[PDB]
Amino acid sequence: MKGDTKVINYLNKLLGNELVAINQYFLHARMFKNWGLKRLNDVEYHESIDEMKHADRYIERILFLEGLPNLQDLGKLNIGEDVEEMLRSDLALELDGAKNLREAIGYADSVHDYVSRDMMIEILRDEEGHIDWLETELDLIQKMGLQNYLQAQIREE
Amino acid sequence: MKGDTKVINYLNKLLGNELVAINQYFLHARMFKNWGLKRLNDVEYHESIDEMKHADRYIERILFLEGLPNLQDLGKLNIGEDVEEMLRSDLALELDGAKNLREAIGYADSVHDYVSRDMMIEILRDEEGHIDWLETELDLIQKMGLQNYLQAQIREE
Amino acid sequence: MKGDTKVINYLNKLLGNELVAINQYFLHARMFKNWGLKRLNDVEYHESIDEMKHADRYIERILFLEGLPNLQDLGKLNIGEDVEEMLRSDLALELDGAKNLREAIGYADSVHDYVSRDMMIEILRDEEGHIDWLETELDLIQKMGLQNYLQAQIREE
Amino acid sequence: MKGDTKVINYLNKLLGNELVAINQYFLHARMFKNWGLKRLNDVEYHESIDEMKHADRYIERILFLEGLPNLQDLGKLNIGEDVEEMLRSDLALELDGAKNLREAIGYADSVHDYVSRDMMIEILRDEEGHIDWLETELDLIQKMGLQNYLQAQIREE
Amino acid sequence: MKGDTKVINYLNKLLGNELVAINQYFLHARMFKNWGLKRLNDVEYHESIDEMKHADRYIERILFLEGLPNLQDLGKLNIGEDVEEMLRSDLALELDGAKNLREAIGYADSVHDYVSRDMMIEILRDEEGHIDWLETELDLIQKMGLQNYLQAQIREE
Amino acid sequence: MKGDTKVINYLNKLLGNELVAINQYFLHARMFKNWGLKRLNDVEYHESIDEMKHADRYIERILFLEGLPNLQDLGKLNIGEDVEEMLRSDLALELDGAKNLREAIGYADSVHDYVSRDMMIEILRDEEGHIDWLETELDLIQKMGLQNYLQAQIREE
Amino acid sequence: MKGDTKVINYLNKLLGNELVAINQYFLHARMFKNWGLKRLNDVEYHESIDEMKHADRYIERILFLEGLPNLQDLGKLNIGEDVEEMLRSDLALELDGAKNLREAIGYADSVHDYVSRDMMIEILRDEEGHIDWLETELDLIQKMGLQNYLQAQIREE
Ligand code: ZNH
Ligand code: ZNH
Ligand code: ZNH
Numbered sequence A, B, C, D, E, F, G: 001m002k003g004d005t006k007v008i009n010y011l012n013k014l015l016g017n018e019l020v021a022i023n024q025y026f027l028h029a030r031m032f033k034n035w036g037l038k039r040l041n042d043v044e045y046h047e048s049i050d051e052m053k054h055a056d057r058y059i060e061r062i063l064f065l066e067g068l069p070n071l072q073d074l075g076k077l078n079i080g081e082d083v084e085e086m087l088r089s090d091l092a093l094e095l096d097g098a099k100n101l102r103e104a105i106g107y108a109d110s111v112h113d114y115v116s117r118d119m120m121i122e123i124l125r126d127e128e129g130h131i132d133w134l135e136t137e138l139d140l141i142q143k144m145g146l147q148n149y150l151q152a153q154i155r156e157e
């Protein structure tokens, strides 16, 4: 079913955001696991899976709308080297992705692509949940100190 | 445990092969799904997942060996527009990847990194299974013709 | 218990037929499997196992009758290169084997080896079932054409 | 997938060794069974089946590599006439076959056919297990004498 | 249904053989049991029951054919006084019985009493199993010696 | 089966490494248990058990190859007196053992003892897992400080 | 809790005896297993485990008493080359061990370390069970002869 060209372009841009997040959150997860921080491995791994699910929804929607999903262009990752830096990088990526989602959601409404809009709002709610988790962890590092914070990540929850 | 620098370079090269194949096989699968070819979606999706598992193994091994996994550089996808072209592109990608695996396996043995060698040989066996499946489907297209072949893909197996 | 020398010679000839058929039907099955013709692999494999069971019966009977089972001399296999040729070759093998079985059954009766005769009649009944299957498939190839016939072999039944 | 011609030639030689062992160990089993030595029938039958499994692995591998499995040429069996002679003949055959396996494993490595090599190492491990069983039974015959040894084979284990 | 007079005569002769074997095998079993040879009691008792079943088949067939089953004229038993002698006497009785069966089967076929023929062939197959067991035990006595053979009979199998 | 004398010598050297590690890891475990560090007792005890399993594999292999397992010569333990020292000592022991494994694996390949090679590579994979765990615990001691690290060992995981 | 210095010296001496027995009984078990003497492998393996449990009891008791367990100084093994020699060597080792235990038990009582005393008496009771089993097997070898004795060890009990 032919979709709106600019909607398809937004969906491809948001798919690009998810592709960056998939890789960044998966590498962060395995870095945490290598450091013995099993709780952070578990959470970041499941954030990666969530982004994979999002990417799948975009791919399927683009194809239904008769556009070409772009999995070729991968944006810049910002991996980082210690826990706080890694979480702050994930948070900045999420916040950037949320701005793009808000823009796309507004436009999808204007062209009456309400099914695309509805899909994107669900994704946005998911991203706001990741933001909450990231902001909270970063606050916990400040409130309890890094040593105590790291001790709290050794065991699965 | 400090690994050999060139082993790490090989693992990063092979990781890059898997990242290409993950994206190419996932997009092909959802294109098959959008065309109603459920059997092909199922197989190609599970091939994508297999490549993901391989990527995970490389990432963890690189990190154990104290290298930096490279998820930033994504090589060229070759998506293609019809079933035969898509399967032939996947086959070409697998064969290129097997050549790279063979080279890396020999080098790993020469520097006595037998655990990396053993991991890669397991991955190579997986890839040769994918090659077998692809070659066989391509032969079936020729033997029964495309119309009969497509009809055989509608229902799940 | 001492058996009749010519009966033992017939049992060794029949054992020789089964040994050819075991190898021909097993290789045919794995050729079909390699071509993705799962249904054909399944039937031909079970035909191979049936022949193995027959060979076992002859070996045990020969030994009971104080003869020497001959597993050294293997007759000529006719493998063939395409589905129809392979099935026709199996059909010819079965029909030759039934001729020999009929001759031996008649002779066993003449020397009063009724237990050997009864064993061979059960084996002949099995062989006539294989003949039926093979003749029917060859007719189906003609009635539906090779393309449709091959498509019908892709999935297990 | 096109294999190396010499590898395929090795696989066919090893297949030939398996085909000899299948027949020799199966006849030995049924000879043991006819003599009432149920424990030896059970073990030798299960060695025969194991060789059948190995032959299947070679057949499928050869076909994948686009070669022609040779089930027509059957080497020399050495049946023998009493328990010790039969076990020693099986041992000599296994030792000959292990020699050919080591040669093929080394060559498969040199041409980078690591999957064929990995298959053959698993088979070699199986053969070394049979060698252990045979050497141990032969030593037991000497240590307890043949009469006691035979008595210990009447009952299944 | 009026049967052939000579068929009935043969069935009564065979019934006579069965009645001898019932008593001889039952007495042998209880002799083995009294000597503590539990395995031999078990086998010979079950041979006796088998002969009882055969006798029942003859009695019923004779009555259907409007003849008179003769359970009055018991033939000569040969009991024997040690294990080998007892087993050799059972073997001689079975072999005599098989000879009579072969003659009766041929005659029944000649007068077209195919049901009686088929019954007798099933019985002959049972008898040939008894011959196999007896010949094998006698060979085992020779191969392991009587002392070891007897030890092997103490425990139920 | 007559094994290569220098393979047996390597297997005895590796067995020697395992015998040292069994004792050092078992004593470390019970020292941790005495200190109330139940998590470290659990891990070190299971490392000791792993080494016992490795030793059993070397002993059985040596005996199959017709050599003499040497359990008499026990190399130098380095027990240590505090948690970090104990873990550094276990790590040094593992790294020395991995070097010997790599040397032995290369040699076994050169004399075509592929089954011993394959056994050793599996053991090496296990040792690299132990190395990973030890390195990570030592990094955690630095990252969270010893007080927090000790607190994290009180409870079983 | 600070123990008596000489009690700790005795516990280390007894621990030393246990460490000799662990290795000797484990190697003997696998020698029996390699020879096909499954019953002897089973018993001697479980004697080895028993000694391991004893060693663990000594190690833990030494640590509680604030001493240093000595796992470094392995005493002399006497392996032996045939079944009777191996069993007699185990018996001599056990008897030497019992003598040391009796001395240690008396001394522990004299310095009022009744818990160490009670631990050692339980261990001595275990050792006296091993002596009983060993003395009995050695007498059985004499009473039935070695050939029959060995036959009795083939099957698990
Ligand atoms: C790159 C990098 C990467 C990696 C490493 C991965 C990995 C992974 C893993 C491990 C898993 C799990 C699986 C199993 O079962 O095991 C998954 C899943 C997964 N995944 Zn993915 N991935 C990825 C990417 C991806 C992408 C890009 C996509 C899109 C395109 C995806 C889509 C996916 C899906 C859909 C899934 C499933 C999910 C669920 O859970 O359901 N993915 N993954
Ligand atoms: C020749 C001679 C001979 C004989 C007698 C036999 C016999 C036999 C028997 C009896 C059995 C069982 C099965 C049932 O019953 O179910 C078998 C199985 C058998 N088999 Zn096989 N074989 C043989 C050869 C053979 C060969 C040659 C091969 C390949 C080629 C085989 C492959 C086989 C298989 C695959 C099987 C299945 C096994 C299992 O179980 O898994 N095989 N085999
Ligand atoms: C002769 C004629 C005759 C006949 C026909 C008979 C027949 C008979 C029958 C059918 C039965 C059932 C079987 C089943 O079910 O498995 C019996 C049982 C019988 N039986 Zn018997 N018998 C007889 C004689 C006899 C004698 C003579 C004796 C003694 C010796 C006997 C002893 C007997 C016994 C013991 C039994 C088991 C019983 C019960 O129930 O428990 N018996 N058998």
Ligand code: ZNH
Pocket (backbone or CB within 6 Å): F019, F022, F023, F026, F049, F052, F053, F055, F056, G019, G022, G023, G026, G049, G052, G053, G055, G056
């Ligand atoms: C010396 C020091 C020592 C000690 C203290 C010990 C102790 C012990 C214990 C406690 C246990 C557990 C037990 C139960 O639970 O029942 C064991 C086990 C044990 N173990 Zn060990 N060990 C030892 C050495 C050893 C050696 C040296 C070897 C080799 C030779 C062994 C081999 C062993 C085995 C095989 C086992 C079983 C394992 C499993 O888990 O499966 N081992 N170990």
Ligand code: NA
Pocket (backbone or CB within 6 Å): B148, C148
């Ligand atoms: Na069609």
Ligand code: NA
Pocket (backbone or CB within 6 Å): D148, E148, G148
């Ligand atoms: Na005896």
Ligand SMILES: [Zn+2]
Pocket (backbone or CB within 6 Å): A018, A021, A050, A051, A054, A123, A127
């Ligand atoms: Zn997302």
Ligand SMILES: [Zn+2]
Pocket (backbone or CB within 6 Å): B018, B021, B050, B051, B052, B054, B127
């Ligand atoms: Zn892959």
Ligand SMILES: [Zn+2]
Pocket (backbone or CB within 6 Å): C018, C021, C050, C051, C054, C123, C127
């Ligand atoms: Zn047949």
Ligand SMILES: [Zn+2]
Pocket (backbone or CB within 6 Å): D018, D021, D050, D051, D054, D123, D126, D127
């Ligand atoms: Zn084999």
Ligand SMILES: [Zn+2]
Pocket (backbone or CB within 6 Å): E018, E021, E050, E051, E054, E123, E127
């Ligand atoms: Zn009867």
Ligand SMILES: [Zn+2]
Pocket (backbone or CB within 6 Å): F018, F021, F050, F051, F054, F123, F126, F127
């Ligand atoms: Zn180890």
Ligand SMILES: [Zn+2]
Pocket (backbone or CB within 6 Å): G018, G021, G050, G051, G054, G123, G127
């Ligand atoms: Zn002890």
